Amino acid sequence: MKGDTKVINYLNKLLGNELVAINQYFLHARMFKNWGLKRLNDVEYHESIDEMKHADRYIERILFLEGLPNLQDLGKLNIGEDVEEMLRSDLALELDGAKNLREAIGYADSVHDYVSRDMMIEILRDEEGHIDWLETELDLIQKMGLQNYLQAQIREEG
């Protein structure tokens, strides 16, 4: 079904956000894993998978709307050197993606692409979750201190 050009454009831009998140989250995960912070690797890895599911959704939708998914262009990854900096980088990235999602959702509604909109709201809800997780971790680091925070990631949570 021929979709609206600007919707497909937004979809590609959002897809673009997803696949920077996928890489940044995945590298972060395996950095944590290397440092033996087993728990941060499990969670951050899981978020990489979430982002993939998002990307898959955009791709299938763009294709359905008869546009060309663009996986060529990759945004700036901002990879940290320590736990805080890296969590803080994921948060800024989540926040930027959420801004773009808000914009796209409003636009989809006004050209009547309600199913694209419905898909994007589900995704936004997921993002809002990722944001909540990051914010809480970052505050915990400050509340309990870095050393205790680190000790608390050595063991995977059941």
Q: Which of 26, 91, 96, 138 binds ligand HEM (CB under 6 A)?
A: 26
Min separation Cβ 40 and ligand HEM, Å: 16
> Is 52 annotated among the ligand-binding residues?
yes
DSSP one-letter string for 89-134: HHHHHHHHHHHHHHHHHHHHHHTT-HHHHHHHHHHHHHHHHHHHHH
Q: Which of 9, 13, 96, 124 binds a second copy (CB under 8 A)?
A: 124
Residue 19 as a binder of ligand HEM (CB under 6 A): the answer is: yes
> Is 112 annotated among the ligand-binding residues?
no
Report the partner that residue 2 touches, choosing among a second copy, Fe ion, ligand HEM, none (CB closer than 5 to 8 A by kind): none
Residue 26 as a binder of a second copy (CB under 8 A): the answer is: yes
- Per the CB < 8 A criterion, the answer to whether 52 and 22 are in contact is yes
Residue 28 as a binder of Fe ion (CB under 5 A): the answer is: no
Identify which of residues 9 and 132 has a Cβ nearer to a second copy in the complex: 132
C-alpha angle 11-58-17 in degrees, rounded to nearest 5? 65
Amino acid at position 43, single letter? V
- Alpha carbon distance 76, 87 (integer Å): 16
3-state helix, strand, coil in the chain (%, to 5): 75, 0, 25
Q: Which of residues 58-77 bind a second copy (CB under 8 A)?
A: 59-60, 63-64, 69, 71-74, 76-77
- No. of H helices and E strands in the chain? 5, 0
CA distances from 134 to 103, 116, 117, 137 (A): 23, 27, 25, 5
Contacts of 63 (CB under 8 A, 6+ apart): 69
- Alpha carbon distance 81, 83 (integer Å): 7
> Is 28 annotated among the ligand-binding residues?
no
Report the partner that residue 49 touches, choosing among Fe ion, a second copy, ligand HEM, none (CB closer than 5 to 8 A by kind): ligand HEM
Given the rule CB under 8 A, which residues bind a second copy? 1, 19, 23-24, 26-27, 30-31, 33-36, 56, 59-60, 63-64, 69, 71-74, 76-77, 95, 102-103, 105-106, 112, 114-115, 118, 121, 124-125, 128, 131-132, 135-137, 139-140, 143-145, 147-152, 154-155, 157-158
Residues at the annotated binding site? Answer: 18, 46, 50-52, 54, 94, 127, 130
Binding residues for heme b: 52
